[PDB]
Amino acid sequence: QELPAQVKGLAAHINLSLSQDLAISESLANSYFIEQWVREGLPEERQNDIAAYLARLMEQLDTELLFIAAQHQGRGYYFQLRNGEFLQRIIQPPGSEDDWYYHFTDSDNAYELNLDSDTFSPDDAFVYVNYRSTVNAANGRPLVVAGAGLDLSQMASLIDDFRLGGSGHASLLSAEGELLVRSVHEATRDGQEVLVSTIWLPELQRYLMVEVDK
Amino acid sequence: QELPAQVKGLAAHINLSLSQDLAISESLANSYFIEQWVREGLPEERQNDIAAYLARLMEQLDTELLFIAAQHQGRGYYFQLRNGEFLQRIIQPPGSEDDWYYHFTDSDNAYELNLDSDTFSPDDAFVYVNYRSTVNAANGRPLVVAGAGLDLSQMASLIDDFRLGGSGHASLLSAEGELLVRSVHEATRDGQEVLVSTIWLPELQRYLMVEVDK
Ligand code: HPA
Ligand code: HPA
């Protein structure tokens, strides 16, 4: 049985690629310079430097979106670097699009990979690598929640990174069954039966299915 | 054959653990805030903030040593955070202990994992994760070479992280044959013959051997 051992290895490669972004999101959320910028009152004069700082990370991670959600004086600020634009806005109450923040910050999870539509551009859905800072604000919420918004097309190129025989389909599913991206048991299907192998990705908290017959 | 597939997976786990430190070393070497501190003339008043910044990384990476080698006005500065001490010195000419720097900076390699004795404490040998910055100084050398110095005892605990049956020995060798750490072919040996499996680690550029008989 070559494929089940093959699937675990290629899943580990996806896991390694995700772990890169996870480590960078962790370091960004707990960056002493970012915390200093937050406690300074988030002065706009330093925004350019912050953007360059995020740009340096964006170039290494090769992710389209980077975000920083910070708490100062009890107010939430959402920053995003994308396509060279540094956007900023105030985090909305839980009744609005920013309820993901209240959800993640109310969870004891250090990180979640939530798929959601961009609050600056509702036309684009990304998978957001929310990582919370170790330091909490005076209101109990994480002082910083920073991470990377991954373009779904990247997820497509990264699962067809390794292809068995150049054909077949690989699929990644949410824990609720929501399909996120598309490139041992016997199943029957339209256009001849196919055999399936699936494994759970811990660092992604998502399931990976891939089918090859012949 | 369970063990050869087992060895590749556990080698990938070692590779994943190393890739964490590699990504952090890359982000640190190309940190815009570090570059700004270097071009500012490396003012001593900001050293405390720099140390806290490195401390935040050291806590996440769980590596004992962090270093920053910077070029300003044609002079090399070596900084190290270890055990809460922020040490600084001037990089010595190629005839002295700092020739590793001239070697790595003369290579076109973005990173090397060189094992060497600490220049601040010659009693302790570490494996240094030298990562060079994308920006170069006016003299042609990398503006920053930053990374983590890993305690060799960590390397020991990370190879016995996963143990087949709780016994056996795992060994990691340099490309020149220098043994770095200790926890498909038939070989004979003192105290009964043993069977060996070896694989090359790309992100570590080192070979991994592990023996189990019965
Ligand atoms: O969950 C999210 N939704 C929208 N924008 C975001 N930025 C980080 N996480 C999110
Ligand atoms: O190669 C090294 N030797 C001594 N100190 C170091 N700090 C980073 N790399 C090294």
Side-chain angles (χ1 to χ4, degrees):
Chain A
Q1 285 186 341
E2 182 249 345
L3 273 76
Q6 179 73 255
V7 171
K8 176 58 184 179
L10 305 183
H13 184 278
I14 297 176
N15 193 292
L16 186 149
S17 187
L18 287 151
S19 299
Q20 304 279 339
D21 311 10
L22 283 159
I24 297 302
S25 299
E26 183 177 358
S27 60
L28 174 61
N30 298 286
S31 178
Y32 174 81
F33 288 127
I34 298 300
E35 167 180 352
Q36 185 170 1
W37 180 60
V38 171
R39 292 193 179 276
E40 281 172 358
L42 301 89
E44 195 135 339
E45 42 273 48
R46 288 186 56 175
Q47 280 184 3
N48 296 278
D49 298 331
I50 299 292
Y53 175 65
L54 292 179
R56 300 306 195 95
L57 305 174
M58 175 161 304
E59 297 169 356
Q60 170 182 346
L61 273 196
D62 194 55
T63 175
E64 166 151 27
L65 195 157
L66 282 187
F67 72 92
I68 299 177
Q71 282 281 315
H72 192 69
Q73 292 279 16
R75 183 173 297 102
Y77 299 127
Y78 180 68
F79 303 85
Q80 171 177 144
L81 190 67
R82 184 193 176 183
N83 299 333
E85 280 188 327
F86 187 88
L87 314 175
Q88 69 177 15
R89 67 176 182 87
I90 298 181
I91 297 181
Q92 297 188 253
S96 183
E97 58 175 352
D98 291 10
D99 59 354
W100 66 268
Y101 174 85
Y102 307 105
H103 276 140
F104 174 60
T105 54
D106 287 340
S107 73
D108 285 299
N109 297 338
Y111 68 94
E112 74 166 345
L113 285 94
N114 186 22
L115 191 151
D116 206 315
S117 58
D118 190 11
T119 59
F120 284 124
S121 185
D123 308 312
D124 290 298
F126 295 109
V127 49
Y128 287 94
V129 189
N130 305 315
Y131 212 111
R132 62 181 295 174
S133 56
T134 305
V135 182
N136 287 259
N139 54 75
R141 297 191 174 278
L143 183 66
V144 175
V145 171
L150 286 150
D151 190 356
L152 268 63
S153 62
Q154 305 184 208
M155 310 280 280
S157 66
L158 289 178
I159 58 175
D160 60 53
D161 195 329
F162 300 94
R163 297 297 297 276
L164 178 77
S167 288
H169 296 87
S171 61
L172 194 156
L173 302 168
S174 82
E176 287 255 4
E178 311 299 327
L179 186 129
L180 299 199
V181 69
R182 289 170 61 95
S183 65
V184 74
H185 291 137
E186 302 88 347
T188 185
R189 191 182 172 76
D190 201 7
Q192 299 178 350
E193 58 182 334
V194 197
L195 183 143
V196 284
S197 289
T198 172
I199 191 52
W200 166 70
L201 288 177
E203 301 268 308
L204 187 53
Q205 291 95 358
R206 303 292 188 257
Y207 283 81
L208 169 71
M209 305 186 64
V210 51
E211 309 185 320
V212 180
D213 185 24
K214 167 191 60 183
Chain B
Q1 285 186 341
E2 182 249 345
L3 273 76
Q6 179 73 255
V7 171
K8 176 58 184 179
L10 305 183
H13 184 278
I14 297 176
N15 193 292
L16 186 149
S17 187
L18 287 151
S19 299
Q20 304 279 339
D21 311 10
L22 283 159
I24 297 302
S25 299
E26 183 177 358
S27 60
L28 174 61
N30 298 286
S31 178
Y32 174 81
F33 288 127
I34 298 300
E35 167 180 352
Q36 185 170 1
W37 180 60
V38 171
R39 292 193 179 276
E40 281 172 358
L42 301 89
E44 195 135 339
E45 42 273 48
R46 288 186 56 175
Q47 280 184 3
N48 296 278
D49 298 331
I50 299 292
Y53 175 65
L54 292 179
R56 300 306 195 95
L57 305 174
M58 175 161 304
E59 297 169 356
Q60 170 182 346
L61 273 196
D62 194 55
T63 175
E64 166 151 27
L65 195 157
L66 282 187
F67 72 92
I68 299 177
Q71 282 281 315
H72 192 69
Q73 292 279 16
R75 183 173 297 102
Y77 299 127
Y78 180 68
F79 303 85
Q80 171 177 144
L81 190 67
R82 184 193 176 183
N83 299 333
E85 280 188 327
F86 187 88
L87 314 175
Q88 69 177 15
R89 67 176 182 87
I90 298 181
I91 297 181
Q92 297 188 253
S96 183
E97 58 175 352
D98 291 10
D99 59 354
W100 66 268
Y101 174 85
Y102 307 105
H103 276 140
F104 174 60
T105 54
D106 287 340
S107 73
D108 285 299
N109 297 338
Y111 68 94
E112 74 166 345
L113 285 94
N114 186 22
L115 191 151
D116 206 315
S117 58
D118 190 11
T119 59
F120 284 124
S121 185
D123 308 312
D124 290 298
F126 295 109
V127 49
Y128 287 94
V129 189
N130 305 315
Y131 212 111
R132 62 181 295 174
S133 56
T134 305
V135 182
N136 287 259
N139 54 75
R141 297 191 174 278
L143 183 66
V144 175
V145 171
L150 286 150
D151 190 356
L152 268 63
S153 62
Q154 305 184 208
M155 310 280 280
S157 66
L158 289 178
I159 58 175
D160 60 53
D161 195 329
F162 300 94
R163 297 297 297 276
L164 178 77
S167 288
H169 296 87
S171 61
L172 194 156
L173 302 168
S174 82
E176 287 255 4
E178 311 299 327
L179 186 129
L180 299 199
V181 69
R182 289 170 61 95
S183 65
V184 74
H185 291 137
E186 302 88 347
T188 185
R189 191 182 172 76
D190 201 7
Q192 299 178 350
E193 58 182 334
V194 197
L195 183 143
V196 284
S197 289
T198 172
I199 191 52
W200 166 70
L201 288 177
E203 301 268 308
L204 187 53
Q205 291 95 358
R206 303 292 188 257
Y207 283 81
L208 169 71
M209 305 186 64
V210 51
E211 309 185 320
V212 180
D213 185 24
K214 167 191 60 183

